[PDB]
Amino acid sequence: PSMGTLMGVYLPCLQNIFGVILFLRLTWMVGTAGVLQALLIVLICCCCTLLTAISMSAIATNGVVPAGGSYFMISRSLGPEFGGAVGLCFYLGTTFAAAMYILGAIEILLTYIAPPAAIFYPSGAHDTSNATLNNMRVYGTIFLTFMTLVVFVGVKYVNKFASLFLACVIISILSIYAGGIKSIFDPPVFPVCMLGNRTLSRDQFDICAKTAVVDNETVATQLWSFFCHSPNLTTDSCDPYFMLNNVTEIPGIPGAAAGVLQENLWSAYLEKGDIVEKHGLPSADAPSLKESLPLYVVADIATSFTVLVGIFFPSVTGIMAGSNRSGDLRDAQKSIPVGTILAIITTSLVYFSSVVLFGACIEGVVLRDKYGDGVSRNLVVGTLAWPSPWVIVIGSFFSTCGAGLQSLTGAPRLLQAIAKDNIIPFLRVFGHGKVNGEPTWALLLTALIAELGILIASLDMVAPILSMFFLMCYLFVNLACAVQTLLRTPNWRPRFKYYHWALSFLGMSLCLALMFVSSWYYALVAMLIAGMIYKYI
């Protein structure tokens, strides 16, 4: 074994922690929650994982660190019963993370790369969502079957391109920060068209004006005809909000300044159907027609604190991938606790600094446009990039497609190990393999379980389920590190300096409170199942 801390522990953690939510949902989270509550979300979600890494360090500093995987360390150092629970929750988390990574790639493809590559179209006036869901499901079943065939044939090729997907993430992050520094002295041009407080969808009309001049004549624009249903300048069919108010352009990226950061500082939660609005604009109050409602940027889902925590939390998962090469290391009891804790610290500093950067550079109206309707269907992250917005689009697409392949390779190997371990006999039949040792019936079960996550067809609906499984895995790791100290069981002497049982107890309680914060109902279901297995024993 010859593999150091950097390329053995640190870089796989840093590759498995960054992902889809930094490029699709972080600006939305900043603009919805405010800078202060977004920093609070990042702080709370990075203390479950830091305390869980302190417990995993106490795992790795005990004994020999047996070769192969993070399942075998836990199972040989904690007894089989905690090992089975940690392994099964981590397996279900990895299989739904594959589905979330596929849904992210299809959102990027259908909204930014090729919008004409769309099968189902929003017929009628309203319900653009059912066309969107049925459009996500078809491409989800296509990409999932293609990638399971790739994993069924070409594992050697998936292991080959693993550095390129990390290079794409790092180049696309450095482009964000390079453009954010340039926005201090030279911000880019993305004008946002508004009407009173209300922001509107710029993709539908031509010019952001109420009237124009053609051939020495004042003629109503296309924007007049959507609100007034007549090309005449003196009709009374207009809605009274359009008549009393005026149409105004603003800079979408006003540049890095303290005045922009002061406006983005507090929460602006909306319900489903509300309109994204500024705060410092004059707006005469008036009723508005129901028919002019598609001419605005509308909140897609109802938001709160507990909604945003469950969507953010799978950004911080990825600790457990620092022990998959635990046999290949030179000093596994030293390279694991340093590598995972430094990876959590660096990725958490990237999230804090990016929350402050997006809160200081981008205006909160553009931030709250999930899918970027206020600026001509562009990434809100991509408009801040330095060379072009296409670098972030292409790089985030290839990185999410790589992160899906890595989950579809990592989860059947894990189910293979629990099957051959024979703690649960009900999972006996998934120990079959080929002559290479590659799993067959486990790959089918991961493809069918990740299919049930793809048929939910939303990035915002699958991510609380991921939070729910990774929080159970991290809860049982902290239970099994606190109980073995309080019971004084033999062969449990962790040689880690910064370990204490109260830290693992605090980590257990925090990763249990986040389980209720993310979704209280399914946490209350899992509490019943856990309280029933305890009565079984």
Ligand X SMILES: *[C@@H]1O[C@H](CO)[C@@H](O[C@@H]2O[C@H](CO)[C@@H](O)[C@H](O)[C@H]2NC(C)=O)[C@H](O)[C@H]1NC(C)=O
Ligand Y SMILES: C[C@@H]1CC[C@@]2(OC1)O[C@H]1C[C@H]3[C@@H]4CC=C5C[C@@H](OCCC(CO[C@@H]6O[C@H](CO)[C@@H](O[C@H]7O[C@H](CO)[C@@H](O)[C@H](O)[C@H]7O)[C@H](O)[C@H]6O)CO[C@@H]6O[C@H](CO)[C@@H](O[C@H]7O[C@H](CO)[C@@H](O)[C@H](O)[C@H]7O)[C@H](O)[C@H]6O)CC[C@]5(C)[C@H]4CC[C@]3(C)[C@H]1[C@@H]2C
* Residue ranges in contact with K ion by CB under 5 A: 17, 19, 317-318
Taking the least distance from each CB to Cl ion, the nearer of 367 and 471 is: 471
Residue 428 or 495 having the CB closest to ligand Y: 428
Nearest residue to 187 via CA among 260, 254, 252: 254
Residue 243 touches ligand X, criterion: CB under 6 A: no
Binding piece for a copy of itself, criterion CB under 8 A, among 309-317, 370-378, 422-430, 463-471: 422-430
Q: Does 421 bind a copy of itself (CB under 8 A)?
A: no
Q: Compare residues 301 and 429 and give the one whose CB is closer to ligand Y.
A: 301
For residues 147 and 447, which CB has a smaller minimum distance to ligand Y in the complex?
Answer: 447
Pick what 271 binds: ligand Y, Cl ion, a copy of itself, none; C-beta below 5 to 8 Å, kind-dependent.
a copy of itself
Q: Which of residues 512-531 bind a copy of itself (CB under 8 A)?
A: 521, 524-525, 528
CB 396 within 8 Å of CB 23: yes
Q: Which of 141, 230, 283, 306 binds ligand X (CB under 6 A)?
A: 283
64 binds a copy of itself (CB under 8 A): no
Q: Is 461 labelled as part of a ligand binding site?
A: no
Measure the CA–CA gap between 320 and 230, rounded to whole angstroms.
Answer: 62
Query: Does 474 show up as a binding residue in the annotation?
Result: yes
5 is in an annotated binding site: no
Query: Burial letters for 478-505: b for 16+ Cβ neighbours within 10 Å, e otherwise?
Result: bbbbbbbbeeeeeebebebeebebebbb
CB of 128 to ligand X, least distance (A): 17
Report how far residue 264's alpha carbon sits from residue 277's, in angstroms, rounded to the nearest whole number. 13
In angstroms, the Cα distances linking 302 to 114, 273, 397 are 28, 8, 27
* Angle formed by the axes of helices 390-421 and 441-454, nearest 10°: 130
Question: Has 314 been labeled as part of a binding site?
Answer: yes
Could you tell me the end-to-end alpha-carbon distance of the chain, in angstroms, rounded to an integer?
Answer: 41
DSSP 45-78: HHHHHHHHHHHHHHHHTSTT--SSTTHHHHHHHH
* Residue count (the chain): 537
To the nearest whole angstrom, how small is the minimum distance from the Cβ of residue 192 to ligand X? Answer: 15
**CB of 200 or CB of 511, closer to Cl ion:** 511
Could you tell me the two tokens for 225?
Answer: 């005809």
Burial class of residue 412, CB neighbours in 10 A (0-12, 13-18, 19+): buried
Dist. CA 311–CA 26, nearest whole Å:
10
Nearer to Cl ion, 20 or 472 (CB): 20
**Residue 289 binds to a copy of itself (criterion: CB under 8 A):** yes
To ligand Y, the closest distance from the beta carbon of 526 in angstroms equals 9
CA-nearest of 240, 171, 212, 209 to 385 is 171
318 is in an annotated binding site: yes
Decide if residue 117 touches a copy of itself (CB under 8 A). Answer: no
Residue 64's binding partner among a copy of itself, K ion, ligand Y, none (Cβ under 5 to 8 angstroms by kind) is none
Whole-number CA gyration radius for the chain = 26
- Tell me the C-alpha to C-alpha distance, in Å, between residue 10 and each of 15, 84, 343: 9, 26, 6
287 lines the binding site for a copy of itself (CB under 8 A): yes
Per-residue burial over 56-90, b if 16 or more Cβ lie within 10 Å, else e, is bbbbbbbbebeeebbbbbbbbbbbeebbbbbbbbb
Q: How far is the CB of 480 from Cl ion (least distance, A)?
A: 16
For the CB of residue 401, give the shortest distance to ligand Y in the complex, in Å. 22
Least separation, in Å, of the C-beta of 7 and ligand X? Answer: 50
Which of K ion, a copy of itself, Cl ion, none is residue 320 near (CB under 5 to 8 Å by kind)? Answer: Cl ion
**DSSP classification of residue 430:** G
Phi, psi of 341 (to 5 degrees): -70, -40
196 touches ligand X (CB under 6 A): yes
498 annotated to bind ligand: no
Residue 519's binding partner out of a copy of itself, ligand Y, Cl ion, none, with CB under 5 to 8 Å set by partner kind: ligand Y
Any known ligand binding at 101? Answer: yes
19 binds, among ligand Y, Cl ion, a copy of itself, none (CB under 5 to 8 A by kind): Cl ion
Scored b (16 or more CB within 10 A) or e, 227-240 reads bbeeeeeeeeebbe
Residues 55, 61, 197, 221: which binds ligand X (CB under 6 A)?
197
Strand locations in 117-246 (E): 191-195, 198-199, 211-213, 218-220
Token pair 């019963």 is at which residue? 81
Binding track, positions 481-500, relative to a copy of itself; x by CB under 8 A = --------------------
Shortest separation between residue 327's beta carbon and ligand Y, angstroms: 26
Query: Are 256 and 363 within 8 A, CB to CB?
Result: no
Q: Cβ of 360: how many Cβ atoms within 10 Å? A: 23
Q: How many residues bind ligand X (CB under 6 A)?
A: 10
197 binds, among K ion, ligand X, Cl ion, none (CB under 5 to 8 A by kind): ligand X
Site of interaction with Cl ion (CB under 5 A): 19-21, 315, 317-320
- 528 binds, options K ion, a copy of itself, Cl ion, none, Cβ within 5 to 8 A by partner type: a copy of itself
- CB of 31 closer than 8 Å to CB of 264: yes
The binding site for K(+) comprises 16-17, 101, 314, 317
- In the complex, the residues that contact ligand X under the rule CB under 6 A are 196-197, 245-246, 277, 279, 282-285
Positions that interact with a copy of itself (CB under 8 A): 126-127, 229, 236-237, 239-240, 271, 287-291, 293, 426, 428-429, 441, 445, 448-449, 452, 455, 521, 524-525, 528, 532, 535-536
The annotated binding site is made up of 16-17, 101, 314, 317-320, 474
Annotated binding site for chloride: 318-320, 474
